[PDB]
RNA sequence: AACGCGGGGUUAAGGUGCCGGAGUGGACGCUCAUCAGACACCACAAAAGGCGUUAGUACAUCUUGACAGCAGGACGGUGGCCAUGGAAGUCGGAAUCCGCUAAGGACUGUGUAACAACUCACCUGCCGAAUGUACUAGCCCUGAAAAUGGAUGGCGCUCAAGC
Ligand SMILES: [K+]
Ligand SMILES: [K+]
Ligand SMILES: [K+]
Ligand SMILES: [Mg+2]
Ligand SMILES: [Mg+2]
Ligand SMILES: [Mg+2]
Ligand SMILES: [Mg+2]
Ligand SMILES: [Mg+2]
Ligand SMILES: [Mg+2]
Ligand SMILES: [Mg+2]
Ligand SMILES: [Mg+2]
Ligand SMILES: [Mg+2]
């Protein structure tokens with residue numbers, strides 16, 4: 017018997033899923049209230065990635081590919097913090113493409129007028145080598 | 158943040174034939190204390206022979222939720238008026254506080270039965286302690302074991318002021 | 331519900347008072363087979379059962395009246411009864427197996443074994459030759475009787491039987507459908 | 520007509536229900552008319568027999 | 571009241587193959603190929619096991635969920651037809667005027683055509699064209715019998731209904747005049 | 762809300778998709794109309810109905826196995842006391858027993874001159890969680906027919922730009 021199915025495969029909301037909020041913060045799901053609301057908290061050491069304990073509306077969140085294994089339902093802040101650090105959530109979040117995009121956006125917005133002049137000149141020197149290489153490969157067809 | 162639960166204690170004015178009158182207590186949901194006291198005299202007028210002009214208020218206090226971080230199931234008994242006759246109902250809700258349960262109830266009665274705030278009497282609000290006390294099937298599916306579900310066809314959030322996109326948006330977030 | 335309540339005390343008292351508990355599986359047995367076996371063994375042994383018991387015997391396993399009662403829980407599947415008697419296992423090995431009935435076909439019943447009519451003379455009136463010519467089976471009217479000179483197979487084993495063939499088998503009084511009380515493992519013996 | 524074929528043909532044009540509001544021809548075991556102009560009425564009668 | 575999860579399953583025999591792509595179903599087997607387009611229904615397909623197909627609807631309404639069983643039966647019939655096939659039978663019913671039926675196989679289009687003559691003694695001649703993939707044949711086991719067979723239940727059933735609906739009696743009491751061609755038996759080519 | 766000629770600020774009733782100054786603003790629901798609906802005075806609609814959908818009230822059945830489908834069985838007096846060319850439950854007059862079980866009537870219906878058969882009631886194999894009846898009131902639908910071409914102000918609007 018041969019079966020070939022090509023369809024979607026979504027990320028599920030569940031106990032242990034890590035969400036990303038509007039202001040770059042992170043949280044872990046501990047309890048499901050409805051199809052629209054969830055109880056979550058993130059006990060992170062980094063002040064830019066930590067969030068308090070409370071209810072989050074799902075319309076203002078995104079599902080990351082990180083799931084904490086065997087997180088008990090309704091666990092308190094102490095138990096979550098222990099499992100958070102044992103798994104290494106902060107290290108795993110830094111290796112995702114979502115984090116790298118955020119870092120790149122932050123760097124470009126922090127450029128001064130002198131920096132903008134220098135980035136133009138540095139790009140030209142790299143561009144000069146690009147045109148020489150492209151002409152060589154294209155000429156050889 | 159629209160409603161709070163209050164404790165109101167009231168009393169008939171003392172007289173020579175009856176010093177030290179009896180004291181009555183009620184639990185009132187109201188947006189502020191000015192209408193909390195007005196609601197108190199409304200209900201007491203319907204049970205005892207007292208008025209506001211022949212009585213006085215003893216104490217007003219705010220009751221706060223004891224654990225506003227624990228998910229609970231609630232049951233509510235109420236009495237309301239339709240366009241012809243009055244009826245009794247029993248409904249259920251799932252949230253983290255008594256104030257949150259009452260606010261959801263008021264919206265629910267307006268949507269499904271066109272009942273206004275002025276035609277509803279709250280009889281009792283009880284937290285259901287056991288999972289066997291759940292009766293309504295729309296709550297039972299939420300307390301199922303090992304719950305999980307995806308979110309298909311999610312519209313991305315786009316700034317209003319940005320007209321004229323240069324690409325076709327996706328709905329797989 | 332009064333009979334069902336009466337059945338509860340009936341089962342509870344009887345299983346304890348009879349140390350010898352047998353298991354019999356009875357599927358599709360007519361009323362008269364039970365009636366004759368009940369009258370024959372009315373004096374000795376009691377045969378009785380009912381609907382399947384999933385907690386009724388659990389009501390017996392709750393107290394340690396017999397620790398073996400909890401080893402009989404997965405055995406019961408459906409339409410299986412118990413037998414109570416004061417006899418021996420050897421004597422009850424074939425006491426309840428007697429009086430096997432011969433059931434005719436049900437106009438389409440599956441015959442597990444292949445059936446064939448032996449050559450010979452039937453001995454009945456040839457006025458019903460319409461039955462034979464409907465299926466086109468050669469028949470000969472000899473001495474005012476129907477005879478089948480050549481053997482004709484009736485139906486392949488495991489194949490359904492047509493209504494005309496079923497009527498012929500009913501009037502031929504030959505069938506492989508023999509019904510009796512099936513046996514089951516008793517007390518892991 | 521052979522009796523079996525008479526029964527076969529009668530199944531399609533004899534064994535029916537009739538709506539008392541819009542005369543619609545309905546299946547034998549129906550309880551409500553399938554037509555919208557009468558509002559899915561539930562007043563049904565059998566189709567008259569030919570004797 | 572919306573239901574969080576509703577699911578159905580479909581077993582698949584080892585003799586055929588199934589392909590799904592953008593909600594376009596293709597069933598391939600020992601007797602031919604069938605295709606169906608289901609892009610009007612919001613459903614999710616998956617491979618539950620080695621030979622089982624899964625159907626899911628998430629956060630569906632009562633009206634939306636009703637279509638889940640409908641999709642399951644349609645695809646299941648597609649599998650049955652490709653592996654066994656379908657077969658309908660029709661019977662002629664008349665009182666006085668015999669009905670004459672002539673069947674020919676067209677060459678340009680490869681379809682079958684059926685002609686009906688002498689219906690209640692009418693001089694007009696009736697003609698119906700069968701759907702492609704449907705084969706017609708006059709019976710030899712008994713008289714006044716038609717047999718229609720094919721791979722698609724939708725094709726066989728609609729063609730058989732075309733023949734039945736063309737023969738009608740007008741301006742008469744139809745409880746008394748019972749002439750026509752009617753379906754009498756539905757089954758499979760194999761078994 | 763009442764009025765001399767001007768400048769700046771804030772509002773009332775009413776509004777914020779375009780005409781049109783200001784939100785395609787936020788939260789929870791209801792509604793699909795081949796005649797949708799869309800804001801006091803005000804420019805109309807009723808009695809009566811719907812197994813369309815949503816919420817609620819009361820009673821009854823069910824893991825000692827409920828509703829649906831499929832499968833098997835359906836016993837003595839007793840052909841009841843009476844009718845009778847004939848009536849065995851089923852032309853017709855008049856009551857309603859136990860053994861046998863978990864289980865079948867001195868019978869619902871088809872049927873025989875009468876039997877018989879088929880039933881059926883009734884019980885039992887299969888199955889695994891609900892099921893039946895009667896009511897209450899929200900939106901939508903039926904009820905709903907006039908004369909030059911036409912008016913939620915217009916365009917148009919469907920997880921609304923409707924309630
Ligand atoms: K909006
Ligand atoms: K209604
Ligand atoms: K307007
Ligand atoms: Mg006429
Ligand atoms: Mg001014
Ligand atoms: Mg507004
Ligand atoms: Mg503007
Ligand atoms: Mg009305
Ligand atoms: Mg049943
Ligand atoms: Mg106008
Ligand atoms: Mg507008
Ligand atoms: Mg609104």
Ligand SMILES: [Zn+2]
Pocket residue numbers: 538539540541542543552553554557559560
């Ligand atoms: Zn109608």
